[PDB]
Structure formats: structure tokens, C-alpha cells
Subunit: 208 residues, 3 copies
């Protein structure tokens, strides 16, 4: 809210994102959601990649917001220049670049988490998932691109993740647990329920 | 709803056939409404979709609850106790419904159309049917069933279950005119693949 | 019957000195407690489905469900609150005055025995039988914590054995709350009958999901 305004991603008003539509208010939210839904549809049409890295993450962020924002596949660790000459600011000590480099070597060394048991898969993904949340590569749209990212990683690893049955409060606490101490246990519990089809089915019977 | 004399002197309780009030009324109304929707599906589709069929849908849904089942609010209704309702000035309901009947007749119930053409045709009538409020209560349910059956007869399918109350409210406000949000709505709705994606984000 | 969190659970000595945290075997509090409880509860429900349905449904089986769900969570797993419970720290619980739990469970057992676990009944007869026992099982609160979940599984298994099916997923929290309050205040069981009638009807359940 104030973060997006501080680093010069909004207009002089202080809350309206600089967009390609030139829209504001509810009209902007509607137009953004429509293109975002279309982008997700085309992404599923595309086959899964052979290697998952930070570059692919930026590609996902690009495909999702290229019709809305000029800084689509760009991370906020570096100042962006709009087409009107205006520039953005960078959060001090962000550690985004060093963070993404770490994620890339892990996904390379562990062979994209392929050829693993689901129990082994959960323990490996949970660490990377938390790290990708500690650093916020993109200014806007982190939640969606991270969700799609790990959903496709899982599918390539023979496992399946269903994020539809996790509440916002559960995810917030799991992240808060190992970023405010170092308790990955709630996150482990999250992915274990999520990667378990029988448990997902039961959760759907209580999703009300 | 209170201003047009559809409730009791208390100010919040709709005049009903049950003589019930409060939470008990909401429960009883919903129960018969659910039964009514089931019975409506039991019945076959009509040959022609017009305002008369719209009133018929409204009748079947609320005939066990309200005495003004198949009645529009463009004309004063007389309850069985002598009390009368009021009519919104310059409602334009009668002329509005007459226009809808002519459109659905000339365009052959939106049949034999492409999906793109179907969206642009339904959205126009849907907005018009929202600009005017034919019934005092129960517009949302009768309009949904109305256009769902129109769509099914036109070879296309609409899933209104994945629309939030806020999105529909904005879509109506936009063209009341910007019809683009309404077009975006119906385009997502008539797209089975998009409906599935929307279901994956219903927290 | 308490309000805005339970002073009742605190008064009968089921919570810690803070006044809102249930005495648990993990020694956790707050959101951490909620997470572990939900996780263990989900695991327990999964294991309950693996085992086959019982031959007879009684109050003992009800306690069994409550045990399996909360045995990793609470020391008083399969225990009803009609009898004082002693924690492993020497502390004892109190018993709600005029609870009527013992007579209530005894009646339910007699009903389920005479009516053959509601098997061999018409759908209409099944509704009137389940609704009565459900209300009675709600009028008395056998367990201090966890009544909603154990009752749901209880009647879901009873129904499945009776050839009928109950889908509680299409019931809002407000509808159930009104239905219970209706036949507890010469009681109006009509909202309860309407609830179970919609629930045991696959066609109505399908429509409810679309609305």
C-alpha cells in the first residue's frame, strides 16, 4: 500500500499503479483480473519446461502482467524506467539477486526435485518455498507467480499440489512460523496436506 | 422495499403467505425456493423466451411465499387484506419488457449464433433487464435461470456460480455506458476452461 | 452457555491459567496450537475412513470417534464431561450442574437399538429419526470440546450404513445454528427436518453447490 507508493510505482495520488490501460479504481482492478485470467489460461496451454530457474519465474511474471505493467518480467532489485522517463526506487538491502541465485543452484543440484519420494519432495520444496517468500523479487504479483511456479515444479516431479484448499490464514502462519524463529514444521504440514489427494478431498468437504 | 409498501408497518418483514417473521421466515422462504428450483428443472424448456416466461419463473419460485408471485411492480398490487403497494415513478418496466420481447424474437432466442455474438447479445438484454427492476424482490434468481435456459437452448453454457457479488455490481454500474466489464463477465462465464480456473481460487 | 469464547471451558478447569488455552499434550498456545490440532484432526479423520463401519452405533462408538480424533491432542480424548477428569498434573475438572448427559446418551442408545441403527427405513422415516437424535445430542453436550466434528462423522456413518447419504458440506454455519436453536426454545423441529431433508437429497445438494 505505502510500499508501492514509496518506490514510485504509483501515480502522484499515491495509490494508483502506473498501467498500460491508463485506468484507475475499480475499472483498473477489473481490467487487470480479466487479462490475468487469460494469461493463466495460455500458460496451461504451454508445456512444462525442462528446467525451473529464476529466469522461468520472471517469464511467468511477464506472461501474467505484460498486458498491464511495463515492468512485467522485471524484479524490483533494480530501478525500472517507464516510457515517460520516470524511474522507480529500490528497497535497501533487498537481497533479491543473491536470493534468486541461491534458488537456481538448489533447483539445479536437486534435479528440479525430480526422482524423489513425496516425503522427500516436501522437505526439499518447503525450504525453497520459504526462501522465495523471504525475498520479494517482484513489486506486485508475487503470490500468483510463486503458486504457478511450484505447481508446475511438482507436476514435473510426479507429485501434485492443490493450493485451493489452503486458507490465507494457514499460509500466513506457516510463513510467519519460520521467518519471525525457524519453524518449518507448519510449512511441512501444509505441503503434506496439499500433496495428499485423500486429505485434499476431505478438506474440500469442510471448505465452507 | 419498505418505501413501496411491501413490508409490514414494523418496517422489515415482507408480507408473506406463511404469516411468519424474522429468521424463521428466511428459513421457510429458502426451503420453498430450493424446492421450486428443483421443480422448475423438472419442467421442459419453453418454445419462446419472453417476458411472460420470466413472470412464470418468478411465479413458480415465490408462489408459496408471496401473493404477488407472477406480478411486476409497474402496477399496484392488492393483498388479501385490502392493503396496496406503491409504484416507482417513471419505472419504464412495461416499455422495457416490450423491447426485450422484440429483441428475443428478431434474434431467434439468440440461437444459431457464434459465442462472441451470443455474449454481445445476452449482455445487452441482461443490462437492460437490470436497469429496470420488474419484480420488487427476487430479480437475481429469476434472471439467472432465465438466461441459463436461453443459453442452453443456444448451444452455449453459462456458469453464474463463479461470479462474486462485487464483480456483478460493478459490471452493472459500468454500463448504467461501459459495457466492457459485462462483456468480460459473460466471456469468462461462457468459457468452461476459465470457469475451472476461477474455481481454483475460491478460497 | 457462555459467549465470545468460552468461560465455561475455563471454569470447569479445561484451560490454562491464561484463561483460554486448552490443556494439551504438546504444551502449545495460540495459532501454533490451532495448527497442530487441525493437522492431527485431519490425520485422524483419514484413518477413520480406512477402517470399516461398525455393526452397532451407540454412545460408546461416539466416544471412540472423539477418542480417535483428539487422543494425540487432549488427555481426556474419549471422555465425556459428565465425570470429573484428572490431568497428569494432578488437576481435576468440574462437572456442569444438571448436565443430563448420562440420561441423554442412555436414551440415544435405546433409540438406536430399537430402530436397528435406522436401517431398513424409508427416507422420510430416516429424516425424522436422525433429526430427533441429533437435537438430543445437541441439547446435551457430552464432550467439553469437539462436539461438532464427532457428531458429523457419527451421523455420516449411520446414514451410509442405512443406505442414505448425508452431505454436511452444503450447510452454512448460520443455518445449523438456527435449526438447533429452533428446537431448544414446545420446540420447533421443523427447521431441523428441512435441513436433513435437503441434505439427504442428492439433487438438492447439487443445486446448493451451484448457488
Amino acid at each position: 500500500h505505502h510500499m508501492i507508493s514509496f518506490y514510485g510505482y504509483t501515480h502522484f495520488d499515491g495509490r494508483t499503479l502506473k498501467n498500460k490501460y491508463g485506468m484507475q479504481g475499480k475499472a483498473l482492478q477489473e481490467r487487470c483480473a480479466y487479462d490475468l485470467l487469460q494469461a493463466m489460461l495460455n500458460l496451461r496451454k504451454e508445456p512444462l519446461p525442462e528446467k525451473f530457474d529464476s529466469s522461468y519465474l520472471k517469464y511467468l511474471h511477464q506472461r501474467l502482467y505484460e498486458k498491464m505493467f511495463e515492468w512485467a518480467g522485471c524484479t524490483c532489485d533494480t530501478p525500472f524506467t517507464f516510457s515517460d522517463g520516470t524511474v522507480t526506487k529500490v528497497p535497501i538491502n533487498n537481497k533479491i539477486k543473491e536470493g534468486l541465485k541461491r534458488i537456481d543452484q538448489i533447483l539445479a543440484e536437486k534435479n528440479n526435485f525430480q526422482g524423489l519420494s513425496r516425503k522427500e519432495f516436501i522437505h526439499e520444496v518447503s525450504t525453497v518455498f520459504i526462501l522465495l517468500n523471504k525475498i520479494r523479487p517482484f513489486m506486485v504479483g508475487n503470490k500468483y507467480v510463486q503458486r504457478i511456479f511450484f505447481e508446475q515444479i511438482a507436476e514435473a516431479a510426479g507429485h501434485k499440489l492443490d493450493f485451493s484448499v489452503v486458507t490465507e490464514k494457514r499460509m500466513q502462519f506457516a510463513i510467519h512460523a519460520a521467518l519471525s524463529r525457524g519453524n518449518i514444521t507448519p510449512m511441512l504440514h501444509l505441503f503434506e496436506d496439499i500433496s495428499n489427494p485423500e486429505k485434499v478431498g476431505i478438506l474440500k468437504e469442510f471448505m465452507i
